[PDB]
Amino acid sequence: TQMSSTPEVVYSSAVDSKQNRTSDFDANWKFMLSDSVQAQDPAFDDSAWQQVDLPHDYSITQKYSQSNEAESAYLPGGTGWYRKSFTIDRDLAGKRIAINFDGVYMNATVWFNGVKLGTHPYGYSPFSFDLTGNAKFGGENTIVVKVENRLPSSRWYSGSGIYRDVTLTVTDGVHVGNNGVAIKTPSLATQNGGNVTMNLTTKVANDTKAAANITLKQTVFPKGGKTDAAIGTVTTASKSIAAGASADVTSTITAASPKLWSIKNPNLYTVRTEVLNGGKVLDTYDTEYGFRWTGFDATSGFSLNGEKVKLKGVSMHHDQGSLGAVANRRAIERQVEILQKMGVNSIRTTHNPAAKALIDVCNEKGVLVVEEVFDMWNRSKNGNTEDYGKWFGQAIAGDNAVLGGDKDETWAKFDLTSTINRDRNAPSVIMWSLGNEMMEGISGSVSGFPATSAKLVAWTKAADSTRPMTYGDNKIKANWNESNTMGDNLTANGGVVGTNYSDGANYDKIRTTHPSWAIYGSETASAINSRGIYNRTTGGAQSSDKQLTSYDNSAVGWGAVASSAWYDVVQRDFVAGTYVWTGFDYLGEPTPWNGTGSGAVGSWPSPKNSYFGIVDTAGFPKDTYYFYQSQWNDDVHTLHILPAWNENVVAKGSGNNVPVVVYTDAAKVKLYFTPKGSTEKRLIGEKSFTKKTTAAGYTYQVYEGADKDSTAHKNMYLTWNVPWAEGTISAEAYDENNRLIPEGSTEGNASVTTTGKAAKLKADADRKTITADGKDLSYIEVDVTDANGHIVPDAANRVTFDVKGAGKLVGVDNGSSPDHDSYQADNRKAFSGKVLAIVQSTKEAGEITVTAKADGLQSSTVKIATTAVPGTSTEKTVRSFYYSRNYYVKTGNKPILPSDVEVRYSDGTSDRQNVTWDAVSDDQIAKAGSFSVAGTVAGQKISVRVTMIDEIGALLNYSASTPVGTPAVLPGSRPAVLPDGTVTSANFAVDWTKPADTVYNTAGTVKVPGTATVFGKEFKVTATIRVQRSQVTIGSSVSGNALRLTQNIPADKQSDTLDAIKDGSTTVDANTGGGANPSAWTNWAYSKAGHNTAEITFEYATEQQLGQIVMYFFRDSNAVRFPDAGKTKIQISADGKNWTDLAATETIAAQESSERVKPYTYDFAPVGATFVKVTVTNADTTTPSGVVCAGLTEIELKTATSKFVTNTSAALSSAEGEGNASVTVVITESEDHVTRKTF
Ligand SMILES: [Ca+2]
């Protein structure tokens, strides 16, 4: 008979010349998550695929799983397929067409109309493909992107897919190049106020079969204004450009007193370049520009446009919380807004190129961007074997037609040059950061690094002379040689040197040791706090309740608290600024509950997001935020109190005394307390700041009274000890002249109060009007208050959102790290009294009513209006058609097409109307191949794909591999094989008789039967899946990379040199004639004092994935003796506090490795350790000296990596497939469904 695909919503997508040069291409893509499918061919039946609008993250929608890794948010990646079908109007004949991706994470492969264009590994750099050569003009075309985010690939939540805008560029054959215009104003600093010299260079490509005679007409005018407001023009002399050649065309414009781009006044200009042949304009290319200049002085730091500025910076990862990696413009904009309110003036794009959207935002909003291109270089971090390290140094394939950067060297060059090409004209970008902690979390020699650095520096210099390059190095603090060489070379090429995690003392060491260097804190603080937690005042370690104090006393081992990292910076004019880790919490890296390896950390649900943020994933500030504001925002006055004032949440100690903290930019603060129901405020105390100002003119405040904190940095804020009592702690603020600061004008909580029980929801939306573009967002904060409207400190009431109208709920969040509730749910628990709902617009104007509801609490309701995009027609238009477009008919039978199809309109109305289908050739009916059929409805042309089948021999069998503990995902469908060799692109839905999930919890092969009914005839298919364990490979020692190596033994009773045990040598110096041994460590001293044991502890700044430990114990004649078997013990932790015994096997080697050195090898399954404490117990023997001792020359802590290997072969053995390949009866398919070899 015939079978038909189920009815899908068909959107008609069209590319004509009526469209703008570059057009949004985000809409109407089909997506499918599938490790197995092959969807490259335009014929493929994508009817059953999910329709999505880009940008889109396909990781964020999958479910959390302990088999994944903490760093990457316990969320999976895998293989995603995007397909989009569209007509190219025949008016585009002659024109050139290109597709542009701003980001695709990661390992993208692109086909156009079945032709494979190429690949792009890196997940954050932008890239392009030409479609011209392969386009079918006046016809149906199909672009296909295959995204393979094979984990592990990130130390943070990557997300997966096309997470950033796609566009189409249509141009004449003679056109300005990709990112073709480069603007320089070499003298602006000098010319400022007068006429400014602009030097343009423009790549003009002649992609025609004829030499071309071209002139450029360039015009600089204010962005958003008309050309007649230009402040400069030029028209070039004729340049002849040969056929299929291109040329760089230099021009100069004189700008009539351009308005400077500044932080306060981010004035932008447009620079339009027209390509002229004869009279006619062939191409017109705009680029956004700002007039601005920077300077770096090694003593007085940074300056913008002549004024001295302090870089008050945050590091920001790319994800947008509950929305995942999706680079939604408004999401991104909102982040910047919140940061600006904090007093931020700079963002470091840690550790990868930003979305253009961010750059765009920063350009208009006036924020300095340090755009970082890379994290790791040629060596991967944290055993993320699939991270860009894999690709950094690889050459580009000859057949790879990817575009955007230089293809003549490595991916590194391409990705770097591509990013610079995109952003070269952006006023906001002040520096190119070329790497981050390049030598952290890696293995093997680093001697190559300084050379790799220079290579990158050179490339950058050549790519963009106009901005200093930089990096963020965390071994400057360790005085590594490599780190020093690299900074000289930075300095030598006009770079600024970023030190990560330096204390004040170290900042000073650098200046003295490196006077040439201009330095900043490239990454600072890394303080770890949750929002609204007050019941303790300590942290920096794994808590029982999976949260951390909001007081600024909690930080990682390598970092420091906010007070500290700012204090160390503000005081030193020569430390140009700070880039705090981080501005906003990000998904992944849940330090102190971090995991570089597979498995849950603590009890599940484990924390899945960060604690570093000043602001949580939802955009709710933590308390520390108001500290930063107090220190950074000179356009507001901060006066903020913590903690919240309820019995159950405060931290009582020293007789009911609770540390009350105040953050403020005021000169004097009087703190009052009012007992409940009373109306009389009792003054608890009064404190005055000291307003110091540095030589360069940066002015800060410290408290220097008698009750000042002993540790200096804590005096950047005020702390009182109030006794706990129901009531209201308020504070009033006075300026330098002792004039009171008005009660209204303060920012932050001017008073905390004891609250009632949870009573009402108050819900407010950030914007009451948004654009009806399917893009814009409204952010709805919901607080849980008592009867009087006081936010309830510990409220965790599950709130349910009812979204009705011209919108839809796209996310819900609370910024709670261990909450695993779906982001894409209609409900979520409040956390510390707050919950967020994100609502997105539709493409039709209307109203959105959103209702926050919770059990036993007064509902709240907000109204949001969506306004239509200017120029959308009020008269109703055709939207889409609902019908089945795929028909498989038996040969000799006429195709039975439907008489009618459901039509949708802009109104959302649905009318079923009739279709007049084209005639089907008699030849075609018995032809036994595929063809398309046109019809017409409501003026528009619909199409249907028909494939004719004579007979089907069988359906191809399937084979895969799965990790033990993870059930195999079986294919939705299987392809058809003719009695003829030929394998069809026609797939038929299979129903599997699935075994229990438990079957996959042991190693072995597993057969699963499944059957599909094809033209009434049921066919029998076997899926033979192989369940496998990880393949673990042990690496080299990382003892060298230790952040710290301490000793149990007190200072006075230590003997020999400890640091010797990570020096990479195993032998003992015989050290005859006394003195401390430089080659080895011992406990001789402590032993003599009668101490039986000793504890050596390695600390790391990143969790190490250990796979083996080898201890090189030694012996002498007098005292030191090899320890007894099984007595030496190892332990591991994530914080330095909570320990765990390493389950290991000891092997004492047969022979000594070197005279009087024997290696004890400890074996164990891979485990993550940020700390490793070896407890050495002396032998139970007697010695000539009568003192028994233990001694070590080296402790090698070897790392390990795990892969899940899936085989590649189509060959046969015993029939059976060699690499568990699918046997079909013999055509075969490898375990990786890539190579099918028929024999
Ligand atoms: Ca050694």
Tab-separated table of C-alpha atoms in Angstrom, residues 418-743:
chain	number	residue	atom	x	y	z
A	418	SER	CA	38.678	34.615	14.168
A	419	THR	CA	37.780	36.143	17.539
A	420	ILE	CA	39.950	39.213	16.917
A	421	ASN	CA	38.463	39.603	13.412
A	422	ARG	CA	34.976	39.715	14.922
A	423	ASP	CA	35.700	42.143	17.742
A	424	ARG	CA	38.559	44.303	16.420
A	425	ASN	CA	36.410	47.436	16.188
A	426	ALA	CA	34.580	47.086	19.496
A	427	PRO	CA	35.433	50.099	21.748
A	428	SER	CA	34.628	47.994	24.842
A	429	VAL	CA	37.415	45.437	24.255
A	430	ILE	CA	40.596	46.777	25.897
A	431	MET	CA	42.801	43.634	25.902
A	432	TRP	CA	43.051	40.170	24.293
A	433	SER	CA	43.657	37.548	27.043
A	434	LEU	CA	45.494	34.637	25.419
A	435	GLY	CA	45.153	31.943	28.113
A	436	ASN	CA	44.272	31.194	31.735
A	437	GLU	CA	46.200	29.087	34.262
A	438	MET	CA	47.889	27.476	31.250
A	439	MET	CA	50.063	25.292	33.461
A	440	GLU	CA	47.437	24.315	36.092
A	441	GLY	CA	45.623	20.961	36.156
A	442	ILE	CA	47.914	19.406	33.530
A	443	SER	CA	50.732	16.821	33.250
A	444	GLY	CA	54.322	16.613	32.049
A	445	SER	CA	57.037	19.172	31.263
A	446	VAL	CA	56.017	22.807	30.994
A	447	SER	CA	59.324	23.890	29.432
A	448	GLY	CA	57.499	24.230	26.107
A	449	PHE	CA	54.964	26.745	27.426
A	450	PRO	CA	56.997	30.017	27.167
A	451	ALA	CA	57.548	29.217	23.473
A	452	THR	CA	53.823	28.534	22.926
A	453	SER	CA	53.049	31.817	24.727
A	454	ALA	CA	55.317	33.805	22.387
A	455	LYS	CA	53.731	32.187	19.322
A	456	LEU	CA	50.267	33.324	20.510
A	457	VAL	CA	51.557	36.797	21.416
A	458	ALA	CA	53.102	37.176	17.934
A	459	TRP	CA	49.863	36.089	16.244
A	460	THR	CA	47.849	38.575	18.341
A	461	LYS	CA	50.237	41.461	17.664
A	462	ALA	CA	49.982	40.747	13.944
A	463	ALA	CA	46.195	40.385	14.167
A	464	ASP	CA	45.516	43.646	16.034
A	465	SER	CA	48.308	46.107	16.843
A	466	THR	CA	45.861	48.355	18.627
A	467	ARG	CA	45.283	46.567	21.954
A	468	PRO	CA	47.657	44.986	24.514
A	469	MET	CA	47.553	41.200	24.764
A	470	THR	CA	47.625	39.513	28.186
A	471	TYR	CA	46.911	36.240	30.006
A	472	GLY	CA	46.078	35.082	33.521
A	473	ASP	CA	48.895	33.098	35.090
A	474	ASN	CA	48.686	31.495	38.535
A	475	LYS	CA	52.323	30.365	38.667
A	476	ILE	CA	53.592	33.956	38.910
A	477	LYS	CA	52.805	33.610	42.620
A	478	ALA	CA	54.939	30.427	42.680
A	479	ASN	CA	57.835	32.168	40.876
A	480	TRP	CA	58.003	29.472	38.186
A	481	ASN	CA	60.711	30.154	35.590
A	482	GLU	CA	58.294	29.643	32.703
A	483	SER	CA	55.978	32.268	34.247
A	484	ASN	CA	58.801	34.849	34.362
A	485	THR	CA	60.048	34.288	30.791
A	486	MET	CA	56.449	34.572	29.552
A	487	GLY	CA	55.810	37.913	31.270
A	488	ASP	CA	58.993	39.439	29.876
A	489	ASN	CA	57.818	38.432	26.382
A	490	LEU	CA	54.346	39.788	27.170
A	491	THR	CA	55.910	43.050	28.340
A	492	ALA	CA	58.231	43.115	25.312
A	493	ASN	CA	55.291	43.068	22.900
A	494	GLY	CA	53.305	45.738	24.726
A	495	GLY	CA	51.371	43.294	26.904
A	496	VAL	CA	49.986	43.621	30.423
A	497	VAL	CA	50.695	40.710	32.819
A	498	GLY	CA	47.787	39.140	34.696
A	499	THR	CA	48.617	37.393	37.968
A	500	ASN	CA	45.951	35.044	39.349
A	501	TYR	CA	45.433	34.712	43.096
A	502	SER	CA	48.298	36.939	44.339
A	503	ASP	CA	48.239	38.370	47.884
A	504	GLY	CA	49.439	41.927	48.563
A	505	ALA	CA	52.853	40.586	49.565
A	506	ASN	CA	53.186	38.822	46.201
A	507	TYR	CA	52.016	41.900	44.239
A	508	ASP	CA	54.993	43.645	45.879
A	509	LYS	CA	57.422	40.795	45.128
A	510	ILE	CA	56.414	41.062	41.448
A	511	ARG	CA	57.013	44.817	41.245
A	512	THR	CA	60.456	44.512	42.777
A	513	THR	CA	61.386	41.438	40.755
A	514	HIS	CA	59.808	42.780	37.514
A	515	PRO	CA	59.752	46.618	37.324
A	516	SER	CA	59.058	46.476	33.550
A	517	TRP	CA	55.784	44.612	34.054
A	518	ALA	CA	52.464	46.401	34.226
A	519	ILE	CA	50.293	44.078	36.323
A	520	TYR	CA	46.673	43.457	37.331
A	521	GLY	CA	44.802	40.791	39.285
A	522	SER	CA	43.530	38.714	36.353
A	523	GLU	CA	41.618	36.389	38.705
A	524	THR	CA	41.108	37.124	42.398
A	525	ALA	CA	39.180	36.088	45.528
A	526	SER	CA	37.363	32.855	44.622
A	527	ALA	CA	35.321	33.346	47.801
A	528	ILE	CA	32.634	30.682	48.318
A	529	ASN	CA	29.287	31.737	49.853
A	530	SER	CA	25.570	30.839	49.438
A	531	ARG	CA	22.742	33.428	49.550
A	532	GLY	CA	21.039	34.251	52.845
A	533	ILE	CA	22.801	31.683	55.091
A	534	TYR	CA	23.664	33.106	58.546
A	535	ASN	CA	23.442	30.301	61.104
A	536	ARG	CA	27.247	29.951	61.055
A	537	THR	CA	30.084	32.382	60.233
A	538	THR	CA	32.637	29.883	58.947
A	539	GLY	CA	33.199	28.078	55.693
A	540	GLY	CA	35.822	27.277	53.099
A	541	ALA	CA	34.945	23.607	53.528
A	542	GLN	CA	32.177	21.108	52.786
A	543	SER	CA	29.220	21.739	55.110
A	544	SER	CA	26.652	19.195	56.304
A	545	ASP	CA	23.783	21.227	54.779
A	546	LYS	CA	25.406	21.651	51.324
A	547	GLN	CA	25.509	25.470	51.665
A	548	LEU	CA	28.064	28.061	52.861
A	549	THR	CA	27.902	31.115	55.131
A	550	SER	CA	26.962	34.457	53.542
A	551	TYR	CA	29.446	36.202	55.861
A	552	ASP	CA	32.698	36.995	54.041
A	553	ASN	CA	34.806	34.417	55.907
A	554	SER	CA	34.596	31.565	53.430
A	555	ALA	CA	37.056	31.076	50.538
A	556	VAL	CA	38.957	28.304	48.725
A	557	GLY	CA	42.475	27.312	49.768
A	558	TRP	CA	44.201	29.180	46.925
A	559	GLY	CA	42.011	32.283	47.118
A	560	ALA	CA	40.998	34.871	49.740
A	561	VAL	CA	37.815	36.587	50.998
A	562	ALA	CA	36.454	39.715	49.283
A	563	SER	CA	37.694	42.137	51.960
A	564	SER	CA	41.201	40.687	51.500
A	565	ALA	CA	41.527	40.591	47.703
A	566	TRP	CA	40.137	44.115	47.348
A	567	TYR	CA	42.245	45.561	50.187
A	568	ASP	CA	45.436	44.163	48.657
A	569	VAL	CA	44.460	45.822	45.340
A	570	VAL	CA	42.954	49.191	46.281
A	571	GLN	CA	46.062	50.254	48.243
A	572	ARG	CA	48.443	49.606	45.317
A	573	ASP	CA	48.251	52.041	42.379
A	574	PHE	CA	50.555	49.646	40.435
A	575	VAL	CA	47.949	46.865	40.573
A	576	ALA	CA	45.808	48.184	37.731
A	577	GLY	CA	42.649	46.373	38.870
A	578	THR	CA	40.964	43.116	39.998
A	579	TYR	CA	38.772	40.609	38.092
A	580	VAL	CA	36.898	38.813	40.872
A	581	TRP	CA	35.977	35.148	40.569
A	582	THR	CA	33.157	35.432	39.881
A	583	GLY	CA	30.501	38.068	39.139
A	584	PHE	CA	27.695	35.494	38.792
A	585	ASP	CA	27.463	31.855	39.894
A	586	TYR	CA	27.735	29.468	36.942
A	587	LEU	CA	26.593	25.873	36.384
A	588	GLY	CA	29.338	23.379	37.299
A	589	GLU	CA	32.533	23.733	39.374
A	590	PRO	CA	30.649	23.266	42.678
A	591	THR	CA	33.836	23.762	44.739
A	592	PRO	CA	34.178	22.861	47.559
A	593	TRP	CA	32.112	19.876	46.303
A	594	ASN	CA	33.982	19.664	43.000
A	595	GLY	CA	34.599	16.544	40.922
A	596	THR	CA	36.898	16.189	37.907
A	597	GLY	CA	35.988	12.488	37.794
A	598	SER	CA	32.762	10.529	37.301
A	599	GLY	CA	30.535	10.102	40.384
A	600	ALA	CA	28.484	12.051	42.970
A	601	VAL	CA	30.251	14.185	45.608
A	602	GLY	CA	28.859	13.686	49.097
A	603	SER	CA	25.243	12.535	49.244
A	604	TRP	CA	23.136	13.012	46.094
A	605	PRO	CA	21.656	15.344	45.124
A	606	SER	CA	25.174	16.855	45.061
A	607	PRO	CA	25.746	20.634	44.518
A	608	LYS	CA	25.607	21.123	40.724
A	609	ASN	CA	26.510	24.845	40.403
A	610	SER	CA	29.070	27.371	41.757
A	611	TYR	CA	29.476	29.157	45.094
A	612	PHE	CA	31.912	31.801	43.793
A	613	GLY	CA	29.401	34.338	42.439
A	614	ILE	CA	28.758	37.689	44.100
A	615	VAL	CA	25.319	37.079	42.555
A	616	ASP	CA	23.596	33.666	42.278
A	617	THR	CA	22.490	32.054	39.012
A	618	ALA	CA	19.080	33.753	39.328
A	619	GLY	CA	20.505	37.249	39.579
A	620	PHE	CA	19.842	37.553	43.306
A	621	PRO	CA	22.768	39.357	45.044
A	622	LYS	CA	24.542	37.683	47.950
A	623	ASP	CA	25.483	39.892	50.887
A	624	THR	CA	29.065	40.407	49.722
A	625	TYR	CA	27.503	42.324	46.755
A	626	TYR	CA	26.868	45.349	48.952
A	627	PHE	CA	30.436	45.215	50.182
A	628	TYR	CA	31.605	45.501	46.552
A	629	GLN	CA	29.042	48.258	45.966
A	630	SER	CA	30.340	50.090	49.047
A	631	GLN	CA	33.818	49.870	47.555
A	632	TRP	CA	33.072	50.447	43.817
A	633	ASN	CA	29.881	52.447	43.034
A	634	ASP	CA	30.461	56.191	43.305
A	635	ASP	CA	27.003	56.942	41.859
A	636	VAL	CA	25.101	55.493	44.855
A	637	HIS	CA	25.382	55.197	48.640
A	638	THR	CA	25.407	51.708	50.151
A	639	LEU	CA	24.164	50.995	53.673
A	640	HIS	CA	23.502	47.268	54.142
A	641	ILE	CA	23.152	45.042	57.234
A	642	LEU	CA	23.423	41.318	57.800
A	643	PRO	CA	22.432	38.875	59.130
A	644	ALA	CA	18.638	38.504	59.011
A	645	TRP	CA	17.096	38.809	62.477
A	646	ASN	CA	15.168	35.613	63.381
A	647	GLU	CA	16.061	33.224	66.244
A	648	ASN	CA	16.616	30.222	63.974
A	649	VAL	CA	18.940	31.804	61.349
A	650	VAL	CA	21.449	33.935	63.349
A	651	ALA	CA	24.681	32.542	64.783
A	652	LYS	CA	24.660	32.850	68.552
A	653	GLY	CA	27.821	32.356	70.572
A	654	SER	CA	29.676	34.232	73.344
A	655	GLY	CA	26.445	34.500	75.354
A	656	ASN	CA	23.877	35.142	72.605
A	657	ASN	CA	26.129	37.623	70.799
A	658	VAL	CA	25.519	37.655	67.022
A	659	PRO	CA	28.094	39.316	64.697
A	660	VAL	CA	26.217	42.084	62.893
A	661	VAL	CA	28.057	43.391	59.800
A	662	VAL	CA	27.507	46.668	57.931
A	663	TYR	CA	28.724	47.459	54.408
A	664	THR	CA	28.674	51.192	53.592
A	665	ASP	CA	30.376	54.032	51.689
A	666	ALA	CA	29.381	56.424	54.482
A	667	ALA	CA	31.883	58.127	56.805
A	668	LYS	CA	30.016	57.329	60.066
A	669	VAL	CA	27.399	54.705	61.032
A	670	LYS	CA	25.200	54.699	64.161
A	671	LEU	CA	23.603	51.300	64.806
A	672	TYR	CA	20.241	51.217	66.646
A	673	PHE	CA	18.150	48.319	68.060
A	674	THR	CA	14.373	48.520	68.608
A	675	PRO	CA	12.757	45.638	70.629
A	676	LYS	CA	9.595	44.143	69.104
A	677	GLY	CA	6.325	46.077	69.522
A	678	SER	CA	8.354	48.934	71.090
A	679	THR	CA	8.846	52.189	69.181
A	680	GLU	CA	12.010	53.432	70.923
A	681	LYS	CA	15.354	52.919	69.099
A	682	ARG	CA	18.337	52.215	71.410
A	683	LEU	CA	21.777	53.238	70.080
A	684	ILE	CA	24.055	50.143	70.241
A	685	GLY	CA	27.196	51.928	69.041
A	686	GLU	CA	28.768	54.296	66.529
A	687	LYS	CA	31.803	53.849	64.238
A	688	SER	CA	33.736	56.215	61.944
A	689	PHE	CA	35.843	55.375	58.891
A	690	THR	CA	39.244	56.810	57.915
A	691	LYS	CA	39.231	58.068	54.299
A	692	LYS	CA	42.682	57.324	52.850
A	693	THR	CA	43.523	58.317	49.223
A	694	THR	CA	46.569	56.929	47.354
A	695	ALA	CA	49.146	58.927	45.408
A	696	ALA	CA	47.411	58.193	42.072
A	697	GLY	CA	44.202	59.425	43.664
A	698	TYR	CA	42.192	56.254	44.411
A	699	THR	CA	40.390	56.771	47.732
A	700	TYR	CA	39.162	53.994	50.086
A	701	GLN	CA	37.879	53.684	53.684
A	702	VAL	CA	39.233	51.566	56.561
A	703	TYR	CA	38.105	51.492	60.221
A	704	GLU	CA	40.916	52.235	62.674
A	705	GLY	CA	39.094	52.544	66.038
A	706	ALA	CA	40.064	50.708	69.244
A	707	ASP	CA	37.636	47.824	68.583
A	708	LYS	CA	39.052	47.392	65.040
A	709	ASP	CA	39.640	43.807	63.870
A	710	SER	CA	43.153	42.443	64.423
A	711	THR	CA	43.337	41.269	60.782
A	712	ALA	CA	43.416	44.513	58.770
A	713	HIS	CA	41.331	43.756	55.676
A	714	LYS	CA	38.179	43.023	57.724
A	715	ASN	CA	38.226	46.707	58.711
A	716	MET	CA	37.020	47.592	55.207
A	717	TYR	CA	33.600	46.972	56.820
A	718	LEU	CA	32.102	47.489	60.329
A	719	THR	CA	31.199	44.682	62.766
A	720	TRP	CA	29.210	44.962	66.024
A	721	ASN	CA	28.276	42.199	68.475
A	722	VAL	CA	24.567	42.613	69.242
A	723	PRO	CA	22.839	40.156	71.664
A	724	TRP	CA	19.941	38.214	70.130
A	725	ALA	CA	16.515	39.681	70.896
A	726	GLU	CA	13.331	39.888	68.808
A	727	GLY	CA	13.206	43.307	67.130
A	728	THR	CA	14.663	45.565	64.419
A	729	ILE	CA	18.382	46.285	63.949
A	730	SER	CA	18.486	49.564	61.991
A	731	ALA	CA	21.450	51.766	61.006
A	732	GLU	CA	21.760	55.437	60.047
A	733	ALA	CA	24.622	56.903	58.003
A	734	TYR	CA	26.445	60.259	58.049
A	735	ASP	CA	28.844	61.824	55.490
A	736	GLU	CA	32.259	63.422	56.134
A	737	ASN	CA	30.610	66.725	57.177
A	738	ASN	CA	28.421	64.750	59.609
A	739	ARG	CA	25.276	65.545	57.566
A	740	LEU	CA	22.893	62.579	57.828
A	741	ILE	CA	22.414	60.471	54.665
A	742	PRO	CA	18.646	60.649	53.833
A	743	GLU	CA	16.646	57.564	54.908
